[PDB]
Design a protein around this motif. Structure first.
Motif, PDB file in Angstrom:
ATOM      1  N   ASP A 165     -12.913   4.760  -6.111  1.00 12.02           N
ATOM      2  CA  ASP A 165     -11.793   4.572  -5.138  1.00 12.02           C
ATOM      3  C   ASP A 165     -10.471   5.060  -5.733  1.00 12.02           C
ATOM      4  O   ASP A 165     -10.046   4.586  -6.802  1.00 12.02           O
ATOM      5  CB  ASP A 165     -11.778   3.117  -4.652  1.00 12.02           C
ATOM      6  CG  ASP A 165     -10.899   2.749  -3.472  1.00 12.02           C
ATOM      7  OD1 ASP A 165     -10.187   3.622  -2.996  1.00 12.02           O
ATOM      8  OD2 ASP A 165     -10.942   1.544  -3.098  1.00 12.02           O
TER       9      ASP A 165
ATOM     10  N   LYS B 122      -3.119  -6.133  11.651  1.00  6.17           N
ATOM     11  CA  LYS B 122      -2.286  -6.124  10.429  1.00  6.17           C
ATOM     12  C   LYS B 122      -1.052  -7.014  10.595  1.00  6.17           C
ATOM     13  O   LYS B 122      -0.268  -6.798  11.540  1.00  6.17           O
ATOM     14  CB  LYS B 122      -1.884  -4.713  10.076  1.00  6.17           C
ATOM     15  CG  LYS B 122      -3.083  -3.818   9.715  1.00  6.17           C
ATOM     16  CD  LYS B 122      -2.637  -2.425   9.320  1.00  6.17           C
ATOM     17  CE  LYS B 122      -3.821  -1.466   9.113  1.00  6.17           C
ATOM     18  NZ  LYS B 122      -3.360  -0.078   9.055  1.00  6.17           N
TER      19      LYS B 122
ATOM     20  N   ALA C  67      -3.207   2.513  11.309  1.00  2.00           N
ATOM     21  CA  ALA C  67      -3.474   1.730  12.493  1.00  2.00           C
ATOM     22  C   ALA C  67      -2.547   0.517  12.485  1.00  2.00           C
ATOM     23  O   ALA C  67      -2.133   0.079  11.428  1.00  2.00           O
ATOM     24  CB  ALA C  67      -4.882   1.294  12.478  1.00  2.00           C
TER      25      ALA C  67
ATOM     26  N   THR D 198       0.628  -0.662  -9.523  1.00  2.00           N
ATOM     27  CA  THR D 198       0.399  -2.129  -9.555  1.00  2.00           C
ATOM     28  C   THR D 198      -0.446  -2.497 -10.768  1.00  2.00           C
ATOM     29  O   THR D 198      -0.880  -3.652 -10.813  1.00  2.00           O
ATOM     30  CB  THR D 198      -0.265  -2.664  -8.295  1.00  2.00           C
ATOM     31  OG1 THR D 198      -1.399  -1.842  -7.964  1.00  2.00           O
ATOM     32  CG2 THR D 198       0.767  -2.753  -7.201  1.00  2.00           C
TER      33      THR D 198
ATOM     34  N   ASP E  33     -12.638   3.869   3.920  1.00  2.00           N
ATOM     35  CA  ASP E  33     -12.607   4.565   5.223  1.00  2.00           C
ATOM     36  C   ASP E  33     -13.377   5.869   5.029  1.00  2.00           C
ATOM     37  O   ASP E  33     -14.094   6.321   5.926  1.00  2.00           O
ATOM     38  CB  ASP E  33     -11.175   4.861   5.657  1.00  2.00           C
ATOM     39  CG  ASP E  33     -10.440   3.650   6.258  1.00  2.00           C
ATOM     40  OD1 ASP E  33     -11.100   2.697   6.784  1.00  2.00           O
ATOM     41  OD2 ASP E  33      -9.233   3.622   6.142  1.00  2.00           O
TER      42      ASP E  33
ATOM     43  N   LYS F  22      -8.903   7.878   8.856  1.00  2.00           N
ATOM     44  CA  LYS F  22      -8.140   8.777   7.961  1.00  2.00           C
ATOM     45  C   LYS F  22      -7.914  10.096   8.668  1.00  2.00           C
ATOM     46  O   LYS F  22      -8.081  11.155   8.086  1.00  2.00           O
ATOM     47  CB  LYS F  22      -8.926   8.879   6.660  1.00  2.00           C
ATOM     48  CG  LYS F  22      -8.819   7.643   5.803  1.00  2.00           C
ATOM     49  CD  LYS F  22      -7.477   7.575   5.091  1.00  2.00           C
ATOM     50  CE  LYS F  22      -7.099   6.270   4.446  1.00  2.00           C
ATOM     51  NZ  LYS F  22      -6.921   5.193   5.464  1.00  2.00           N
TER      52      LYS F  22
ATOM     53  N   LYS G  66      -6.358   6.960  -4.415  1.00  2.00           N
ATOM     54  CA  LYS G  66      -5.421   7.566  -3.445  1.00  2.00           C
ATOM     55  C   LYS G  66      -4.377   8.406  -4.172  1.00  2.00           C
ATOM     56  O   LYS G  66      -4.042   8.098  -5.293  1.00  2.00           O
ATOM     57  CB  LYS G  66      -4.730   6.495  -2.587  1.00  2.00           C
ATOM     58  CG  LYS G  66      -5.726   5.555  -1.888  1.00  2.00           C
ATOM     59  CD  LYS G  66      -5.124   4.439  -1.087  1.00  2.00           C
ATOM     60  CE  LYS G  66      -4.590   4.808   0.260  1.00  2.00           C
ATOM     61  NZ  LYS G  66      -4.147   3.595   0.998  1.00  2.00           N
TER      62      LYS G  66
ATOM     63  N   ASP H 106     -11.345  -3.571   0.687  1.00  2.00           N
ATOM     64  CA  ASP H 106     -10.747  -3.122   1.937  1.00  2.00           C
ATOM     65  C   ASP H 106     -11.903  -2.735   2.874  1.00  2.00           C
ATOM     66  O   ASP H 106     -12.753  -1.928   2.419  1.00  2.00           O
ATOM     67  CB  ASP H 106      -9.778  -2.011   1.531  1.00  2.00           C
ATOM     68  CG  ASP H 106      -8.848  -1.579   2.641  1.00  2.00           C
ATOM     69  OD1 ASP H 106      -8.527  -2.453   3.468  1.00  2.00           O
ATOM     70  OD2 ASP H 106      -8.456  -0.353   2.663  1.00  2.00           O
TER      71      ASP H 106
ATOM     72  N   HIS I  84     -12.811   5.892  -1.282  1.00  2.00           N
ATOM     73  CA  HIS I  84     -11.981   5.016  -0.421  1.00  2.00           C
ATOM     74  C   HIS I  84     -12.842   4.495   0.735  1.00  2.00           C
ATOM     75  O   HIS I  84     -13.594   5.252   1.335  1.00  2.00           O
ATOM     76  CB  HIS I  84     -10.787   5.802   0.096  1.00  2.00           C
ATOM     77  CG  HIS I  84      -9.876   4.961   0.961  1.00  2.00           C
ATOM     78  ND1 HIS I  84     -10.147   4.701   2.272  1.00  2.00           N
ATOM     79  CD2 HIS I  84      -8.807   4.225   0.637  1.00  2.00           C
ATOM     80  CE1 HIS I  84      -9.258   3.834   2.732  1.00  2.00           C
ATOM     81  NE2 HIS I  84      -8.375   3.569   1.764  1.00  2.00           N
TER      82      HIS I  84
ATOM     83  N   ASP J  81       2.120  -0.024   7.222  1.00  2.00           N
ATOM     84  CA  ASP J  81       1.558   0.862   8.258  1.00  2.00           C
ATOM     85  C   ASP J  81       2.104   0.416   9.626  1.00  2.00           C
ATOM     86  O   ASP J  81       2.302   1.266  10.487  1.00  2.00           O
ATOM     87  CB  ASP J  81       0.045   0.840   8.362  1.00  2.00           C
ATOM     88  CG  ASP J  81      -0.682   1.627   7.286  1.00  2.00           C
ATOM     89  OD1 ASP J  81      -0.105   2.635   6.833  1.00  2.00           O
ATOM     90  OD2 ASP J  81      -1.883   1.250   6.996  1.00  2.00           O
TER      91      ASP J  81
ATOM     92  N   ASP K  12       0.876  -1.200   0.000  1.00  2.00           N
ATOM     93  CA  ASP K  12       0.000   0.000   0.000  1.00  2.00           C
ATOM     94  C   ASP K  12       0.900   1.233   0.000  1.00  2.00           C
ATOM     95  O   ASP K  12       2.134   1.106   0.258  1.00  2.00           O
ATOM     96  CB  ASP K  12      -0.975   0.027   1.191  1.00  2.00           C
ATOM     97  CG  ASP K  12      -2.176   0.954   0.994  1.00  2.00           C
ATOM     98  OD1 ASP K  12      -2.162   1.711  -0.063  1.00  2.00           O
ATOM     99  OD2 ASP K  12      -3.023   1.027   1.937  1.00  2.00           O
TER     100      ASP K  12
HETATM  101  N1  LIG Z   1      -5.179  -2.959  -6.861  1.00  2.00           N
HETATM  102  C1  LIG Z   1      -4.934  -1.884  -6.119  1.00  2.00           C
HETATM  103  N2  LIG Z   1      -4.001  -1.000  -6.529  1.00  2.00           N
HETATM  104  C2  LIG Z   1      -3.795   0.114  -5.818  1.00  2.00           C
HETATM  105  N3  LIG Z   1      -4.405   0.520  -4.716  1.00  2.00           N
HETATM  106  C3  LIG Z   1      -5.358  -0.371  -4.353  1.00  2.00           C
HETATM  107  C4  LIG Z   1      -5.681  -1.549  -4.986  1.00  2.00           C
HETATM  108  N4  LIG Z   1      -6.713  -2.205  -4.324  1.00  2.00           N
HETATM  109  C5  LIG Z   1      -7.045  -1.390  -3.345  1.00  2.00           C
HETATM  110  N5  LIG Z   1      -6.201  -0.292  -3.271  1.00  2.00           N
HETATM  111  C6  LIG Z   1      -6.298   0.877  -2.344  1.00  2.00           C
HETATM  112  O1  LIG Z   1      -5.657   0.622  -1.104  1.00  2.00           O
HETATM  113  C7  LIG Z   1      -6.518   1.194  -0.085  1.00  2.00           C
HETATM  114  C8  LIG Z   1      -6.078   0.905   1.340  1.00  2.00           C
HETATM  115  O2  LIG Z   1      -6.104   2.163   2.158  1.00  2.00           O
HETATM  116  P1  LIG Z   1      -5.984   2.408   3.790  1.00  2.00           P
HETATM  117  O3  LIG Z   1      -7.299   2.618   4.415  1.00  2.00           O
HETATM  118  O4  LIG Z   1      -4.981   3.381   4.151  1.00  2.00           O
HETATM  119  O5  LIG Z   1      -5.574   0.900   4.242  1.00  2.00           O
HETATM  120  P2  LIG Z   1      -5.526   0.250   5.756  1.00  2.00           P
HETATM  121  O6  LIG Z   1      -4.551  -0.836   5.457  1.00  2.00           O
HETATM  122  O7  LIG Z   1      -6.851  -0.187   6.338  1.00  2.00           O
HETATM  123  N6  LIG Z   1      -4.782   1.354   6.681  1.00  2.00           N
HETATM  124  P3  LIG Z   1      -5.373   2.565   7.627  1.00  2.00           P
HETATM  125  O8  LIG Z   1      -6.920   2.538   7.563  1.00  2.00           O
HETATM  126  O9  LIG Z   1      -4.660   3.748   7.024  1.00  2.00           O
HETATM  127  O10 LIG Z   1      -4.716   2.086   8.919  1.00  2.00           O
HETATM  128  C9  LIG Z   1      -7.835   0.629  -0.629  1.00  2.00           C
HETATM  129  O11 LIG Z   1      -8.965   0.913   0.171  1.00  2.00           O
HETATM  130  C10 LIG Z   1      -7.741   1.266  -2.019  1.00  2.00           C
HETATM  131  O12 LIG Z   1      -7.858   2.677  -2.138  1.00  2.00           O
END
Ligand SMILES: Nc1ncnc2c1ncn2[C@@H]1O[C@H](COP(=O)(O)OP(=O)(O)NP(=O)(O)O)[C@@H](O)[C@H]1O
Ligand SMILES: Nc1ncnc2c1ncn2[C@@H]1O[C@H](COP(=O)(O)OP(=O)(O)NP(=O)(O)O)[C@@H](O)[C@H]1O
Ligand SMILES: Nc1ncnc2c1ncn2[C@@H]1O[C@H](COP(=O)(O)OP(=O)(O)NP(=O)(O)O)[C@@H](O)[C@H]1O
Ligand SMILES: Nc1ncnc2c1ncn2[C@@H]1O[C@H](COP(=O)(O)OP(=O)(O)NP(=O)(O)O)[C@@H](O)[C@H]1O
Ligand SMILES: [K+]
Ligand SMILES: [K+]
Ligand SMILES: [K+]
Ligand SMILES: [K+]
Ligand SMILES: [Mg+2]
Ligand SMILES: [Mg+2]
Ligand SMILES: [Mg+2]
Ligand SMILES: [Mg+2]
Ligand SMILES: [Mg+2]
Ligand SMILES: [Mg+2]
Ligand SMILES: [Mg+2]
Ligand SMILES: [Mg+2]
Lengths: 375, 375, 375, 375
Positions: free
Chosen positions: B151, A253, A249, B215, B15, B233, B153, B226, B13, A259, A106
């Motif tokens: 979705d 994980k 978080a 990717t 979250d 966030k 980022k 996810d 996204h 993260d 990520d």
């Molecule tokens: N194939 C992919 N290529 C690139 N990004 C992707 C792909 N699949 C999903 N993602 C992104 O990766 C995100 C993860 O974001 P994030 O919420 O920061 O993750 P988390 O691991 O739960 N961490 P956090 O909530 O920050 O502790 C997904 O929700 C998408 O926006």
């Protein structure tokens, strides 16, 4: 002259309940499958735990028994407390659908920090906030104060005078308790068994304000009082606000998630710089792009306390530390069921964790050319 | 010379989906009952939204219609994208069970920040990270790139040279998309429609690295990819890591919750100090004890950029700003359904929000004795 | 000579908990909006109630308070019993998205029955099975046996001799109870307070077998012991198996649902035929096609006990009863909050319900030409 | 002269979706652990499946994959149909916490039935109702009518003349379909491909009424239209109302649950009596007390069609059949993953099931002394 404040919460705070369930599920999986992929998000509220997310694993775990065991250990074992391990609902919605050059899973940014204001190289405010709630749990579970209940919070305001701790200005301690104890009894017991044994007497003066259960009775709590979710105590988990945070978080994980792993590595890096005597305080930022092994950025901040030029420090870090996502796992020996223990009372400052070893400090010190010339 | 990195995420996204549902529910309630108490926690994953927590209100709202409307607006309207507003599950577990001297509803610590490195007095990295994902959403919804999916980022690494922006070192843009677009087409379109129109050309040089969908294919996303939860966030919502954070989430909380109101107030304070010319950058920390109106602490940090002594600034803040929990609500006119708009693309830097007004700047400047002497 | 058996369950049996929640939600809605459309399906198990389905209504109800109130009344108020009204989870997943010629809302088939073997024109086995569990609840709630807990079942096997009750061959009574009562004490108390006061002494002989808590201790029950769902006690709700059943559940359905309204009407029809003296026992079947007002079929079965030709009975039924779906609602005055009371201890045999009135009996008798000729 | 009506529903009706998930989970467990204890209750509605209850097993199954596979096979694979196997929510709340003299696991009553009005010794109305929806599924899945969607219902009203089938009076067929087919096209195709090939032309006359999609368009269905729960089609599962029912559901129950095993045994008994020529129709009732091996009652009803005295039949049944709960499992070879196949289109009348074998018929006939005397 500045006042700085940090908080912590006990293992029975609902957000911390969620963190500990997420990490109890991670540990159970890693015990069987050390390379499992785990992203386990927990939600607790009145009568229920929802454990969800995504796992890639050969392991076979009983999510319901792990959950109930976790809640029981925290101490929720009766409807009178608001929550019962044995009789709550547990719902599961987990979907089960050169190695050092592997890309980050990520994007994101992660910070690590160290300061020599404590022996564990942590900021004093978060250190003493954690010790207060950890003490609350110890005197609850050992029968010293058997009327305590699992949910508590602490908050400590330190006074600094140009960056030196002068004392403690304010202390908040809010604890859950059974119906039978009166508030004057509760305040005296919390002062004598929790506050006075944990906070250095030198820092406690006539200027110190104490707010013990300042709203009085706190009988109902844990999930009945407040919804709890994984990853909602990220500043309690880290440096109590003294250092910056990238937003990720930790709990639920596996170590392939930068993260968690890169925040652990950034702590290890900062702590070894400060233990080396290369700065008095050090904040590291790293960031990743999904599918890219080399971090998109590394920043070393020493707040003007560096003992060698800043550019030379950045070099030392690239030299001694492999911050590629699988370099991290190797650097810290992370593929072991060690995470439930992190999910309450802070991920940093407990020196048996692999990212708290200062086994690079002499190396960095030697490599920087720090050593005394005579005559 | 340092590299600093911030990220942002689109309204799609997972979250951020949770944040926006939580705040859509808050707004719907405040439209009917401005003094409602709301603590609305959302959890989204494959096929479902769970909206939970606690409300004290006279309002009557349809949680299911608000949820479905929110997801539809974000753009999830078909199983091919991984999630459908019209056909997902919505589960509800909301329990409906002198005024300026009212105590804080909880303990905690909150930070606010301002810097004159942008015209909106925000850090550049978070500013440009938000603008990138906001642009991704605009060209998706206006049909400029109709194959985009909700979705996304962004991540931007700025280069600083003793605290002055030199340029942008690295740009990450990861977007969801339909099956029909190929990756070379997607990369060219994202560079031409999203990146080049948002990032100043001056900051983009031969040293700039671009990671667009590094990717490759990203067809499945939102909750299918996810789990998403409210308040995950908090660094995207604030200053992208440039400033510290107290740990509290904003979305789904009414203005009586100091985690939201005091962070908004701390932004207002910092922004008015910097707009006044009393510092070039300013971080405010405040903290509360449950049931206590006066903050347990206030800290004003100016990183050596203050134009008047630091002690005098602390005084100006006590003088001009009422940081008691109900002084906050009055100070910022908060009892209105204005929050869904904050729950994506950042709570700060959009100058129509009440905590972004600089209506105290001349007042503070006059009170500090800043004005030019002639002859 | 034949043995026939029927069962009943108390208000604390988990399936019956679900039925009563579904109907408590229906009643709350009909109190505000008598023409509401309601299809409310409940699922209870360890720690949780899920209340789902579909409502079309102007009413505003608090599903969580109605649920908790319902469980509290049933008697689940502590983790020691396995379930607590005050601390369980309540999840809601209710989607809120010439008049006599209106079509049936669904296809289906429905039966009604009456027999003059009891004064209420019900089969004796279901009658006495219901009375046993109703008695268990009465002596639990009135403090006669305060150690009883809400979950119980009864079962009675009658002996018939060419269709005349000879006696009771077997009696099963299984009750939940607190930890403090021993099984010999429990068996004596259940025999003296529940069984002997309800079953006629004439029917109890040396041939009668009694199985009181035949597995002994029954401390844990209600939802902790057994998942409960709406519409899983349809034979307890009706005639205990003596009569046929069309498969439709009653509870959580408004009177526009022919599964409920036409079964009530079929009971009313059968009961008035038997009260008229036109048969000693009578089973009615009716069926509908979705969108069609006139039933697809009507069948009158009298098991050779008719006092007028069978074809003439079928005619009397078309003549006196309007079985169109809205003729039903008019025929029985159904648009009132009367349903929670039906959702335990049987929908038939309690003579204050509108479908238990025998206000057509003399009419049918006159219309059939039954009356004595002299001289 | 009487009209009798039975219905059936396709594998895509929401209640039947729940039954098939419950039994797919049972089969998956029995494949690994034939003696597993399983009580698996399913609840489906808009966007979600909840699979709950209680299992005692050594087996390790993926409830989510089994659920998604089951829904996919039924045919729900897109948001346009109202429900998608691949993208719906699946929540799990399953708690995993001389042998022939073992007691019944629960009290209850169970009926079995046979009649020689069809070759499979089933009532004609349920037989032809099942064949209609089974035909609807076959022409949907084989591409004969590719616009059909999974949810359908059938209903058939037979005319009897003193107990002999005269013909079919009414036929209801309601099917889900895609948006593209018009209703006249749909009615012609359902008449030609589903109705005319299944119902004997002899029974179809000028008096026959046909209600094909009598409300017209039926695009949205399955769980989006109607909540579905395990055990809500118990009369479709058995004899279509022609025979009585004890109230117990079959699906999601292992063969130790007498609600399933004793109903299967009662069918086997009735069917072998009728196949023996000992009656033309036969209804068996059995009942149990929890913890008691011998049934509390057995009843043999032959509706005056017996070829030997009724008391002698009751004797033959005690003689040839072991109705103790573990005698049942032995009698029918039940410890095999054979149940998903029962969970749509009826538990009886398909002659490869073990309880449909007539391997006792000659035995009973010989034991009764039925055989022709000459001269
Ligand atoms: N194939 C992919 N290529 C690139 N990004 C992707 C792909 N699949 C999903 N993602 C992104 O990766 C995100 C993860 O974001 P994030 O919420 O920061 O993750 P988390 O691991 O739960 N961490 P956090 O909530 O920050 O502790 C997904 O929700 C998408 O926006
Ligand atoms: N009567 C009470 N007196 C004092 N503290 C209480 C009382 N009732 C509950 N609390 C505490 O207040 C806590 C709230 O903590 P926290 O998780 O920070 O709240 P939040 O509003 O969800 N914010 P965050 O998750 O930080 O964004 C509860 O979970 C208890 O520890
Ligand atoms: N537009 C429509 N036209 C015709 N039939 C429809 C339509 N929409 C849905 N239906 C069908 O009606 C069914 C209702 O069946 P059923 O399960 O018997 O209902 P129920 O009211 O829950 N009763 P039961 O479970 O029998 O007590 C749906 O699930 C569909 O098969
Ligand atoms: N220890 C025990 N002793 C006796 N009865 C008990 C015990 N534990 C639970 N029970 C009862 O057994 C009941 C099961 O009833 P029932 O709902 O008919 O079961 P089911 O298997 O789901 N069948 P059905 O819903 O009829 O298809 C429980 O809910 C209690 O009333
Ligand atoms: K909360
Ligand atoms: K996640
Ligand atoms: K059950
Ligand atoms: K339903
Ligand atoms: Mg919280
Ligand atoms: Mg992240
Ligand atoms: Mg996240
Ligand atoms: Mg907080
Ligand atoms: Mg049941
Ligand atoms: Mg029905
Ligand atoms: Mg149904
Ligand atoms: Mg039963």
């Amino acid at each position: 002259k500045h006042l700085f404040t940090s908080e912590s919460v006990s293992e029975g705070h609902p957000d911390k309940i969620a963190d500990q369930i997420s990490d109890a599920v991670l540990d159970a999986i890693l015990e069987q499958d050390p390379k499992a992929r785990v992203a386990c998000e927990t939600y607790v509220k009145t009568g229920m735990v929802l454990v969800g997310g995504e796992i890639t694993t050969s392991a076979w775990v009983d999510i319901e028994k792990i959950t109930r065991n976790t809640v029981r250990e925290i101490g929720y074992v009766h409807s009178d407390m608001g929550f019962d391990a044995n009789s709550c609902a547990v719902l599961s919605a987990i979907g089960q659908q050169d190695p050092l050059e592997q890309g980050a899973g990520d994007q994101g940014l992660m910070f690590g920090y160290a300061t020599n204001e404590t022996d564990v190289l942590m900021p004093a405010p978060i250190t003493y906030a954690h010790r207060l709630v950890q003490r609350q749990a110890e005197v609850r579970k050992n029968g010293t104060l058997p009327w305590l209940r699992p949910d508590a919070k602490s908050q400590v305001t330190f006074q600094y005078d140009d960056g030196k701790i002068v004392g403690i200005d304010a202390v908040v301690l809010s604890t859950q308790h059974s119906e039978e104890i009166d508030q004057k009894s509760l305040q005296e017991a919390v002062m004598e068994e929790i506050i006075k044994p944990i906070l250095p007497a030198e820092w406690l003066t006539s200027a110190t304000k104490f707010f013990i259960n300042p709203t009085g009775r706190f009988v109902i709590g844990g999930p009945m009082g407040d919804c709890g979710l994984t990853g909602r105590k990220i500043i309690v988990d880290t440096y109590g606000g003294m250092a910056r945070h990238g937003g990720g978080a930790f709990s639920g994980k596996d170590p392939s998630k930068v993260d968690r792993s890169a925040a652990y590595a950034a702590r290890y890096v900062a702590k070894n710089i400060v233990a080396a005597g290369l700065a008095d305080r050090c904040e590291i930022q790293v960031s990743y792009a999904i599918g890219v092994a080399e971090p998109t950025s590394i920043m070393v901040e020493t707040f003007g306390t560096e003992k060698v030029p800043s550019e030379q420090l950045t070099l030392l870090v690239r030299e001694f530390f492999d911050l590629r996502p699988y370099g991290l796992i190797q650097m810290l020996d992370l593929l072991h069921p060690i995470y439930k223990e992190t999910a309450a009372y802070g991920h940093f400052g407990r020196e048996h964790f692999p990212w708290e070893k200062t086994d690079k400090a002499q190396l960095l010190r030697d490599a920087a050319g720090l050593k005394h010339h005579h005559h």
